[PDB]
Design a protein around this ligand. Structure first.
Ligand SMILES: Nc1nc2c(ncn2[C@@H]2O[C@H](COP(=O)(O)O)[C@@H](O)[C@H]2O)c(=O)[nH]1
Ligand SMILES: Nc1nc2c(ncn2[C@@H]2O[C@H](COP(=O)(O)O)[C@@H](O)[C@H]2O)c(=O)[nH]1
Lengths: 188, 188
């Protein structure tokens, strides 16, 4: 019977694989960044890698729906197909910092589900600069869900469970009232 | 064990099985009713069976926290251990009608999760004035947090178990989170 509108699934970590696990009805958003590609990273898979001038040009022409400066570099979510996908019932995964999560929760509250991935302790976070991570963590209370990341695989499972639950939310169903009126009509 | 175990009052409704399968960190609640015991049913297991006078006496002295008339008979949820169980991190399963669900959603919004279990069709419902009654109950599913179409009992049980697990990770249900983060991830 019932179709569901997509969710914009926003995941934030400080520590920074799990997303990989999660994707293996959701598509991965690829962000634009001004930072250099690191060993093993590939254009179009990890990020779209551009310079500061091009990043600003893309913002100026409407192609970036969110952006922030994160530890000295720009990062932004491309506008392309996002809202499209929500209408189609396709969810999108965004792995962004708290500034980005806050922006999504403010601008698209009804379609966003936010999850903060917490390290199990500071000592474990250090083993995985930390002042920045502590400040990021202090924004956890604004997120819909929080998960302590002991094991990556378990975290991925719990995120998958949250996504599946959120897809069954009544407020995300399309045409429920019409469905009830047609299939379970009150007579008289 | 950085975050503390969280307890939900899980309200399930259908048109007046799935419950049993879910239970076999949540405990059953046994309701009071004024209807007659049916074949196979046992006091203290299926319901506390009382007469109308005694039911109204239990409502006066505060021992019943919710009550409704459901198809000519009274039903109610005993107050005993519900609030204390939420404090212990222990979830409670309430299998109640829409009047009960609405009451819990208004009385204890922050602790309640409601799920409406829809039959797959009116014919399936009918083979399980009465249909007019069921359609009216069903009309209320728009006010529930979640709606699930019951195609397969076991699938429905797994989906409910998934929703329960997800809701237990909601940030708003962790108590003392801010103080936890301040102690374990201090900003310096
Ligand atoms: N606000 C925002 N943050 C992003 C975006 N893409 C990545 N990030 C965040 O930037 C931080 C640095 O990522 P890294 O440089 O380690 O890949 C991480 O928190 C990551 O989630 C984005 O499009 N917008
Ligand atoms: N409001 C309310 N409904 C209840 C309670 N206990 C059972 N019910 C509901 O009353 C209806 C009739 O239950 P039955 O008589 O078939 O066992 C069902 O929808 C059941 O969920 C209760 O404590 N409160």
């Amino acid at each position: 019977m019932l179709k569901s509108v997509g969710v914009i699934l926003v995941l934030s970590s400080p520590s920074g694989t799990v997303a990989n696990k999660l994707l293996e009805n959701i598509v991965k958003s690829v962000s634009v960044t001004t930072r250099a590609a690191r060993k093993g990273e590939k254009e179009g898979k990890d990020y779209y890698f551009v310079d500061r001038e091009e990043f600003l040009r893309l913002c100026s022409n409407g192609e970036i729906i969110e952006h922030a400066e994160v530890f000295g570099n720009f990062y932004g979510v491309p506008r392309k197909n996002l809202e499209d996908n929500v209408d189609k019932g396709v969810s999108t995964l965004l792995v962004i910092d708290w500034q980005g999560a806050f922006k999504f929760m403010e601008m698209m509250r009804e379609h966003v589900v936010s999850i903060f991935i917490m390290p199990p302790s500071m000592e474990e976070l250090r083993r995985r600069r930390l002042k920045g991570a502590a400040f990021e963590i202090s924004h956890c209370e604004a997120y819909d869900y929080v998960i302590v990341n002991e094991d990556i695989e378990e975290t991925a499972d719990r995120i998958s469970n949250i996504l599946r639950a959120e897809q069954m939310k009544t407020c995300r169903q399309v045409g429920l009232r019409e469905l009830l009126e047609s299939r379970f009509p009150i007579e008289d």
